[PDB]
DNA sequence: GCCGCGTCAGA
DNA sequence: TCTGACGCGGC
């Protein structure tokens, strides 16, 4: 609620800049989950770290 | 992505511009798929723009 | 290394 | 005298003949827009420029260019008000012919194939109308020209603040149009630096080694060889005289056997002319001296071909001695002397890291893209492109004459990029400024601030949307097979036209018009901003810029410019300044030749101006230009003095010249204080058009150029006389002198009536000619907003009286007469626009009709049956202007709530409402009901009845034209048919079709005859496809907004009338807030009775020496008295020659006076309607700085029987005994501001509230409560008053919970308050928690 | 003066070239001979005497070469570094120069 | 729609009625009231905090009233009578018999408070005007006939006040202030003082002063061009000249206003302070001062450049005549640099008092005596020639 | 803050020294909440709404 | 131990 | 920008 993503008239929706930090977060961390299961090269690991 | 394409065609070739029946028109669409699609994508704008 | 934290650089090099 | 001025001739006072009229005003925008968009047979700036610039297109050696042949503007779709009606940019489509060859690929260059492409379309760009504002969205904008610093080269000093030594660190900047900047600089140890654009610092001679120039070139470059012998004794040294100046001598420095100059002394001329003399040039020279020396070249053991000593060293008596036994005669030292020549150079080479080539690139490389490893070609390419690239560096024409300029050079034009001379050059310039020989740059000089106007960055912004469109053309040039791809695919119109509708919509430049007044507009379009892209900022800059510079004058205006954080950063262009070619502003002079004025104007940039001594305006002069005085006032150098008679090259071209035209609309202005006529202006220029506009009693001869120039008046195109004039149009039976050989025709002239400005006012035109009366070319027809006869009229007359009246102007604030509302004279119309749209919902669409639940039909009586409200309704707060319902479900309302709905049987309906209504305190007329509908919708009865009045509407105003026009026609037509024979019946009777085949004398008769059979043909075609056309127009649907079915927009009309409050002012920055609306048997009157209608303070006039409104006041009583003497002499009906011999004495009445009255206006017609015209008082004439003395006024009382004094006795209104003192009364032009105080009283009690905070804020007519900021909050303690301030910071902003206690407290008459905890306090613990910190309340 | 003024008073701002002070009381004397500083050495005619400080050599000693010197004195000349009055003079010292 | 602010509040605001806005908050609880009523009402602060000085003195059509009022003209209508009080005063001005500027004599009653606060009165003939002495039925008691009895400028008129609250109290003084702001405004309006053209008197001198000073400066000018005298040299004897020049035309323009009015006594003539209203604006403190009024009918003296330096060539011009447009166009400077001076030193002060508010805030008064012996030896102040600041203000 | 409005100034000066001239419509809308309840107060309404 | 320099906060 | 403070480093 304090992020909030609450819609404008005629579908323009505003959101708070913390809303895509936040998600950028969490799909780097999904992906460096799925890449630590795929037991990936080295590398590729420590970049995404 | 399709209607997008399918717009700089029409933009381009018919030189104004696609009304949304020229669209359907070049699509298959019923014409209001066209419209529902044509909601969709507008994306949110951010909570900070300076007014 | 130039001290560098651009991770693109990083990466690339 | 044209006619247009025998209907009110203004008596010019100001004595100095006028030799060059004012330009036009708007010429910078037009003429900036014209050099934009149009066939430039070459690569001029302009459109075709940027083509040329970018193209051909020539894939990555794949043998298929793209090149570009021509373009061509297409025709604008809608019309200008077409799209402000309908909100949308009023632009035209970009049509460009474009060709792709393919190469013939497996032999030499050849051509195979071509696709010429049909004209790939590649976006709008939006026009500019007739007065250079833009209509973006249908809110007409404006692009401020910008000053901004010059490319080019410029040498700065950086003083005193460096090392706390004092020190000047001189540096010089190289800035380019586009591309990277480039800085050298000095340090406190003088080593000389470089730096690209902003990065870390390098010593210079990195870049020096980079452009492949050894450290033997490098010294070869920057100094001069000293050249030793070995003679076969001792170390002699060739020496030539001059390099010896201040010097302590080493040696005794003999020549010849016989001593010149004396070890330990400092030379003398004598003893260089000694040396000149001898012709020395030979001397013995001690190894010591040759000591401290550097070597300048590189010297090798050529006795066996190693090294000795590398170049740039500093000798030793064992390398002497080295290079004495290998056998080097002649030794090469550098010449370093630190009076002149520093050792800069060596110094930082030495500094210098690096050695050769390829390290420097490395080392460049490393501190632009740091962290990557240095590949030798990829620092080779950077450096390349850095600065020598085409492509990604631009001086510019004017920045490399600029540039030339600074290095004295001869040639103007160069190439875009730099090269190696360049840079070594401003090397040695900055060296040079090092040693002394030479000055630093001010960065303020106007010489050195360049305009870019609209075209010049509309050109740019389109120039970046092609490079883009080039990335992807070449980019699917390199990739597919091209035979099929014609040279429109590869081209994307959403880029450019992205770049473009950025700049034009949402740009620090682009700006919504300031629209109150004809001055506002044609103010606003002569601003020169300072800011936007690539100029300073509001907070950056910086004391320093702000201050106006001898320069800017005759080209800026030194005293218009806003008053806040912007001051100094505004400067609105003056009035006689131009553009030069490049942009630098230039203003005219008149040429001197020996000593008689001539009239050649030159006009004069600021570096010319510079040079010569250029005389005031006001120099008195004798018919022959002769300077009548010995020694005249000049500024010469940047600096005033007196100067011979026979010394000045230019005089000023006239007295105006220095001032804008916001400034040169005040009269009297070098009788106020610079920073009152600073307020006047600004407040002058937000004047709010009154209900009927009359003119300026005392004005300054300017107002008619701004009232015309600015587009909002009708100005005849072609002379003739009244046709047919009406309160919407004008119809003029041109001359025929003036008509083209076909198309006879007529002129129409349609005038905007009652529209919306952008400042919610309302623009609107009247007809000032009657019907028969003669007009002329670039005369005045309809006067529009705020203008009356052709002449700029703000405000209105005042009769206005000095005294302190019981406090009422206690401060600023003025005490008005109720005969000044009464008579409606700063009652001002305002149009509010509403819009009430109908979305489609996810849960249904919503609906317009009527049908809205529990409002009586109390508030459905004004809506029609179609839920649109009446055009003419007079409505108020709260009333339904558009009844809109939307679908509505989910109640689940509360357990009491729904044993009401049962006992009282209400359907809880499930549309809930959500018309449009009026906002409260706003009462006014509906004037007009727009509708626009997706296309698709079925159109509702008032849509169609508005279609069906707007498409009778267009028949008839077609129909019109034809008709009249060929009514038109058709007299001519008979006239020439009374030629080839004057046949009366059988040629009249006939319909007037039957000559399409009839036969005339082979004379223009039958010419003209068939003419018109082209005209008959053709336009019956045009008349049949354009009705369909604009039928089309009006039937078809709008492109509205995506998700909203249909919008309905209704404008209403207030009338707001004058109230305590308001904000009004003269026009000498004598502000002021009405206070009392008196009654007139309470103003000060004098023995005729007549009450005064202002009683402004005295005490304003003393602090702020604004005494230019106390020299108006008495101008103006001067003038409204010989309108009162005209007016009795009208009343009596006295004769014409009466009028005639007065109104003549009282346009003469002065010395040396310009207004030369023609004195031959028609004995009595004329004469009589002037005299009707000037019965409300004689318009004067005061130009800027020629003002009218203060003798003249007092000769103007004379002639009008009246106090010389201009102050007259008054009797006081409410008790009847007289003011001792006489006061002075008189008539002030008074303006009405629109800072209107129904348009700032807001209050709430309670309201919505904000989201994530939950702290007020509105903007629906309940707005947020006032900000409690800080500065508040410590008032409050500085009070002991805590519960005070706990009330404020907790229930009536945040406790979410504690304000709805505390409301259910009020109204229940106990006054308590529950503190609770602020919100905004959770918000921040939230806040401080989500980041890694445990932070929380404790017990 | 002016607005800046009060804000370096305010801000206790150091002078740019303060007026040196004496530390402690007692006879001075020079010493080490300008390794771009020269010494000089407030001797306490009874305390603790060998107090030393390293000064350069721009500042013109109001004290003699050998001269019988108070704490909280003037040496050198030029602004007061406010930090110094309030170690030596004391505390109303700085409170009266604020 | 429009707040209606009493005038004598104005100047604690930093008020004017030139388009400026004022916020209204309702305080809700019944301690809001009370504090508002108690620590926040109008009637409470009329002293400053900064300075003990009242922050209630009346402005500038006030001051103007009483000062005009309360002068004296030389041979008036009504001159030497010998009136019965002050209300007889009122009643000869308003009944048009006596001028309100009549050097009369009035039988005062002064109460001053001399026992254990007990009012005493005294009765006397004193030796006053008109005006004085209808001014007198505003004072309340414990005050001396002398606090009127002079001619009452904008500095008098403060004292007056600050001397009523320190013998009488709260409510007396602040029913004076209201009395004094009202008769202020009667008798301003009553006076019809107003500003004329003709009002800015330039001497006759003045022509003749500026021709010397360019004479001078001529030959300054030729003794540089043979070089008896270094540029450095010339150019600053130019400026002291000038300097010279424009001092004298202050002195002239000063002694034509100050006193020009000599008229007849009622014998032959005599001469008297003046009543050129913009002298009066000037010499009561309502407005302007001899800077302001000297650029009216002086001249406005030497120009700085950007640079700070100083122009040779004064503006010789006043504004009741017309500058020429370089004169104009060098006045512009300075009036720019102040513009943006002012701007910029807003911003600047606000971030001062920011951070003084803040090291600060927490600062309060908690026990009634720390009962101890530490102290400072304050002085007065003095630097050079003279004192700065007296004892008195600095205990 | 609520319970809060703006306007501009002007003179007035019959006023005494604790008074303020209060616009009609601002103060009606100002106290509100106030006059609600006097107004239930007095029965000359019968409810708040 | 003493001076130059990069970095950040703040208007 | 610019000013100041200050780690942080070079001499
Ligand atoms: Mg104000």
Redesign the interface.
């Known amino acids: 609620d304090l992020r909030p993503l609450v819609p404008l008239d005629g579908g323009r929706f505003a959101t708070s800049d913390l809303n895509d930090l936040y998600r950028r977060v969490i799909n780097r961390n999904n992906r460096l989950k799925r890449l630590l299961d795929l037991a990936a090269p080295d590398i590729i690991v420590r970049n995404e770290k | 992505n399709k209607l997008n394409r399918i717009s700089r065609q029409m933009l381009q070739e018919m030189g104004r511009e696609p009304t949304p029946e020229e669209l359907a028109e070049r699509m298959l669409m019923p014409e209001d798929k066209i419209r529902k699609v044509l909601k969709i994508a507008k994306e949110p704008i951010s909570m900070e723009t300076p007014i | 290394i130039g001290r560098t934290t651009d991770p693109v650089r990083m990466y690339m090099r | 005298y044209s006619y247009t001025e025998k209907k009110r001739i203004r008596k010019d006072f100001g004595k100095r003949p006028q030799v060059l009229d004012v330009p036009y005003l708007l010429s910078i925008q037009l003429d900036s827009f014209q050099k934009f968009i149009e066939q430039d047979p070459e690569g001029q700036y302009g459109l075709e420029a940027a083509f040329r610039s970018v193209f051909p297109i020539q894939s990555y050696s794949g043998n298929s260019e793209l090149q570009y042949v021509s373009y061509r503007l297409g025709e604008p779709v809608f019309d200008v008000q077409e799209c402000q009606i309908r909100g949308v940019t009023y632009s035209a489509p970009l049509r460009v012919k474009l060709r792709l060859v393919i190469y013939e690929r497996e032999a030499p260059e050849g051509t195979v194939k071509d696709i010429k492409e049909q004209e790939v379309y590649m976006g709008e760009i939006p026009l500019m109308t007739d007065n250079g504002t833009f209509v973006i969205n249908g809110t007409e904008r404006v692009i401020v020209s910008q000053l901004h610093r010059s490319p080019g080269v410029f040498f700065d000093s950086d003083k005193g603040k460096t090392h706390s030594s004092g020190k000047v660190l001189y540096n010089a900047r190289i800035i380019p149009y586009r591309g990277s900047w480039l800085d050298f600089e000095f340090d406190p140890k003088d080593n000389l630096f470089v730096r690209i654009d902003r990065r870390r610092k390098l010593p210079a001679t990195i870049i020096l080694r980079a452009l492949n120039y050894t450290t033997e070139q490098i010294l070869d470059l920057f100094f001069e060889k000293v050249i030793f012998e070995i003679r076969d004794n001792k170390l002699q040294m060739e020496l030539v005289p001059e390099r010896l100046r201040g010097e302590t001598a080493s040696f005794d420095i003999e020549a010849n056997g016989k001593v010149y100059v004396e070890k330990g002394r400092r030379i003398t001329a004598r003893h260089i002319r000694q040396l000149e003399k001898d012709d020395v040039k030979l001397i013995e020279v001690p190894v010591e001296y040759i000591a401290g020396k550097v070597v300048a070249k590189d010297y090798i053991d050529e006795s066996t071909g190693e090294l000795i000593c590398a170049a740039n060293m500093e000798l030793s008596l064992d390398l002497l001695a080295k290079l004495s036994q290998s056998g080097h005669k002649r030794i090469e030292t550098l010449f370093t002397n630190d009076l002149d020549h520093g050792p800069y150079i060596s110094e930082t080479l030495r500094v210098d890291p690096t050695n050769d080539r390829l390290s420097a690139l490395v080392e460049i490389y490393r501190m632009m893209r740091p962290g990557e490893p240095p590949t030798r070609e990829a620092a080779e390419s950077l450096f390349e492109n850095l600065f020598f690239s085409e492509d990604r560096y631009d001086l510019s024409a004017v920045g490399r004459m600029k540039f030339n300029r600074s290095l004295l050079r001869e040639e103007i034009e160069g190439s875009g990029i730099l090269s190696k001379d360049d840079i070594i050059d401003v090397m040695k310039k900055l060296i040079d400024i090092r040693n002394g020989k030479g000055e630093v740059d001010d960065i303020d000089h106007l010489g050195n601030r360049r305009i870019r106007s609209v075209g010049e960055m509309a050109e740019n912004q389109f120039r970046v949307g092609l490079v883009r469109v080039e990335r992807a053309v070449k980019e699917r040039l390199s990739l597919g097979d091209l035979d099929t791809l014609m040279p429109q695919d590869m081209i994307n119109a959403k880029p450019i036209s992205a770049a473009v509708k950025e700049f034009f919509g949402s740009s620090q430049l682009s700006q919504f018009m300031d629209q109150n007044n004809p001055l506002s507009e044609i103010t606003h379009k002569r601003r020169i901003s300072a800011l936007g892209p690539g100029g300073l900022t509001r907070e950056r800059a910086g004391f320093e810029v702000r201050d106006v510079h001898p320069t800017h004058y005759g080209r800026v205006c030194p005293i218009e410019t806003p008053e806040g954080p912007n001051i100094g950063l505004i400067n609105s262009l003056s009035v006689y300044a131009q553009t030069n070619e490049y942009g630098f502003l230039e203003t005219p002079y008149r040429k001197v030749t020996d000593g008689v004025v001539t009239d050649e104007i030159h006009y004069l940039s600021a570096i010319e101006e510079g040079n010569y001594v250029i005389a005031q305006a006001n120099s008195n002069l004798d018919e022959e230009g002769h300077f009548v005085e010995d020694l005249v006032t000049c500024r010469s150098k940047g600096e005033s003095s007196l100067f011979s008679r026979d010394q000045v090259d230019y005089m000023d071209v006239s007295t105006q010249q220095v001032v804008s035209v916001g400034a040169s609309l005040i009269p009297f202005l070098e009788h106020d204080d610079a920073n009152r006529a600073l307020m006047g202006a600004n407040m002058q220029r937000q004047a709010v058009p009154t209900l009927r506009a009359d003119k300026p009693l005392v004005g300054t001869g300017m107002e008619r150029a701004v009232a015309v120039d600015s587009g909002v008046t009708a100005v005849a195109k072609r002379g003739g006389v009244v046709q047919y004039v009406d309160a919407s149009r004008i119809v003029i039976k041109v001359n025929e002198d003036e008509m083209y050989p076909g198309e006879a025709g007529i002129d129409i002239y349609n005038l905007t009536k009652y529209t919306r400005s952008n400042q919610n006012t309302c623009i609107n035109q009247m007809p000032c000619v009657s019907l028969g009366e003669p007009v002329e070319r670039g005369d005045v027809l309809a006067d529009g907003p705020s203008t009356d006869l052709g002449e700029l009229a703000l405000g209105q007359n005042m009769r206005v009286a000095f005294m302190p009246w ?6 600023d ?1 003025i005490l008005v007469s109720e005969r000044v509302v009464q008579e409606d004279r700063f009652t001002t119309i305002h149009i509010q626009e509403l819009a009430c749209v109908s979305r489609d919902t996810k849960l249904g669409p919503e609906e317009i009709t009527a049908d809205i639940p529990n409002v009586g039909e109390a508030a459905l009586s004004k809506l029609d049956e179609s839920g649109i409200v009446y055009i003419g309704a007079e409505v108020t707060g709260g009333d339904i202007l558009v009844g809109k319902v939307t679908p509505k479900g989910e109640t689940q309302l509360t357990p009491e709530e729904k044993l009401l709905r049962a006992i009282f049987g209400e359907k809880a309906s499930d549309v809930k409402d959500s018309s449009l209504r009026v906002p409260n ?1 706003v009462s006014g007329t509906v004037i007009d009901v727009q509708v626009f509908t997706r296309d698709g919708v079925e159109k509702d009865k008032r849509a169609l009845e508005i279609e069906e009045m707007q498409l009778k509407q267009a028949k008839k105003d077609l129909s019109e034209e034809l008709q009249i026009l060929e009514a038109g026609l058709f007299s001519r037509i008979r006239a020439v048919l009374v030629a080839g024979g004057v046949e009366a019946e059988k040629l009249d009777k006939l319909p007037r079709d039957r000559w399409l085949e009839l036969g005339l004398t082979d004379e223009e008769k039958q010419n003209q005859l068939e003419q018109l059979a082209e005209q008959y043909d053709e336009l019956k075609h045009e008349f049949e496809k354009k009705l369909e056309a604009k039928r089309r127009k009006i039937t078809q649907g709008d492109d509205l907004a995506p998700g909203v079915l249909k919008i309905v927009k209704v404008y209403l009309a207030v009338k707001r009338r004058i109230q ?2 308001d ?1 009004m002012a003269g026009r000498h920055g004598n502000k002021g ?3 009392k609306i008196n009654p007139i048997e309470d103003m000060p009157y004098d023995e005729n009775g007549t009450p005064v209608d202002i009683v402004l303070n005295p005490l304003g006039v003393p602090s702020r020496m604004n005494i230019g409104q106390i020299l108006e006041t008495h101008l103006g009583m001067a003038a409204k008295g010989i309108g009162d003497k005209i007016n009795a002499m009208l009343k009596q009906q006295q004769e014409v020659a009466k009028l005639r011999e007065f109104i003549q004495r009282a346009y003469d009445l002065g010395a040396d006076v310009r207004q030369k009255v023609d004195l031959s206006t028609f004995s009595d017609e004329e004469v009589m309607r002037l005299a009707e015209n000037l019965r409300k008082g004689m318009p004067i004439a005061t130009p800027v700085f020629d003002g009218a003395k203060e003798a003249e006024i007092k000769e103007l009382l004379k002639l009008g029987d009246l106090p010389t004094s201009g102050q007259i006795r008054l009797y006081d209104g409410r008790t009847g005994e007289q003011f001792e003192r006489p006061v002075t009364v008189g008539y002030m032009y008074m303006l009405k501001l629109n ?1 209107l ?1 129904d348009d ?8 919505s509230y904000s989201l994530v905070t939950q702290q ?1 804020l509105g903007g629906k007519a309940q707005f947020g ?4 900021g800080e500065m508040e909050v410590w008032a409050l303690e500085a009070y002991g008053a805590a519960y005070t301030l706990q009330e ?2 907790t229930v ?2 945040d406790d979410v919970n504690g ?1 709805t206690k505390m ?1 259910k407290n ?4 106990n006054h308590q308050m529950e503190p609770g905890m602020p919100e905004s306090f959770n918000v921040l613990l939230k806040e401080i928690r989500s980041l890694g910190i445990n932070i929380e309340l404790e017990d | 003066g002016g607005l800046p003024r009060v804000a370096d008073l305010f801000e206790a701002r150091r002078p740019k070239e303060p007026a040196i002070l004496a530390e402690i009381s007692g006879i001075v004397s020079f010493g080490k001979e300008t390794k771009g500083k020269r010494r000089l050495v407030i001797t306490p005619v009874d305390g603790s005497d060998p107090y030393e400080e390293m000064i350069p050599k721009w500042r013109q000693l109001n004290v003699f070469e050998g001269e019988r010197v108070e704490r909280g004195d003037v040496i050198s000349d030029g602004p007061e570094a406010p930090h110094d009055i309030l170690r030596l003079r004391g505390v109303h010292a700085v409170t009266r120069y604020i | ?9 104005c100047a604690a605001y930093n ?1 004017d ?1 030139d ?8 305080p ?1 609880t019944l301690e809001a009231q009370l504090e508002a009523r108690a620590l926040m ?3 409470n602060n009329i002293l400053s905090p900064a300075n003990g000085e009242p922050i ?1 003195v009346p402005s500038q059509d006030v001051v103007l009233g009483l000062y005009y009022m309360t002068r004296d003209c030389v041979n008036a209508k009504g001159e030497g009578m010998v009136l019965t009080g002050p209300k007889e005063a009122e009643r000869l001005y308003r009944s048009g018999l006596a001028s309100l500027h009549a050097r009369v004599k009035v039988r005062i009653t002064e109460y001053e408070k001399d026992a254990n606060g007990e009012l005493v009165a005294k009765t006397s003939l004193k030796d006053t005007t008109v005006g004085r002495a209808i001014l007198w039925m505003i004072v309340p008691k414990g005050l001396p006939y002398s606090i009127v009895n002079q001619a009452l400028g904008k500095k008098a008129i403060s004292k007056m006040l600050n001397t009523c609250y320190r013998i009488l109290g709260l409510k007396p003084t ?1 029913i004076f ?2 009395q004094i ?2 008769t202020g ?1 009667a008798y301003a309006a009553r006076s019809g003082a107003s500003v004329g053209i003709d009002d800015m008197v330039i001497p006759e001198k003045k022509h003749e002063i500026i021709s010397e000073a360019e004479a001078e400066v001529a030959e300054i000018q030729e003794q540089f061009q043979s070089g008896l005298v270094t540029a450095g040299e010339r150019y600053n004897k130019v400026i002291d000249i000038w300097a010279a020049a424009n001092d004298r035309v202050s002195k002239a323009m000063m002694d034509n206003l100050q006193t020009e009015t000599v008229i007849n006594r009622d014998g032959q003539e005599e001469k008297q302070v003046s009543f050129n209203s913009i002298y009066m604006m000037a010499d009561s403190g309502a407005r302007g001062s001899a800077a302001q009024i000297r650029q009216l009918a002086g001249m406005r003296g030497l120009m700085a450049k950007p640079d700070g330096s100083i122009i040779e060539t004064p503006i010789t011009a006043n504004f009741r005549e017309g500058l020429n447009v370089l004169q104009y166009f060098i006045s512009t400077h300075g009036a720019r640099k102040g513009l943006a001076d002012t701007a910029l030193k807003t911003a600047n002060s606000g971030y001062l008092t920011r951070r003084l508010v803040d090291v600060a805030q927490d600062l309060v008064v908690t026990e009634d005596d720390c009962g101890t012996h530490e102290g400072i030896m304050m002085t007065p102040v003095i630097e050079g020639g003279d004192v700065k600041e007296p004892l008195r203000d600095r205990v | ?13 019959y ?9 009609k ?2 103060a009606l ?6 006059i ?3 107004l ?2 007095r029965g000359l309404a019968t409810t ?1 709404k």
């Open positions: 019981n406090g009422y102007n206690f401060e604030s305190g305590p409050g904000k807030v009405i206070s800072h105080v700032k009283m807001h209050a709430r009690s309670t309201g007020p409560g006032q900000r409690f404020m910071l009536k902003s304000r409301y009020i109204v229940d008459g | 729609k429009a707040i209606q602010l009493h005038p004598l509040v008020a009625f388009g400026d806005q004022m916020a209204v908050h309702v809700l009402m109008s009637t209630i602040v202030a209201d702001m009202y405004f | 803050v609520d319970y809060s409005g703006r306007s501009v100034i002007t003179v007035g000066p006023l005494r020294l604790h008074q303020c001239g209060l616009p419509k601002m809308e100002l106290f509100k909440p106030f609600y309840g006097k239930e107060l708040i």
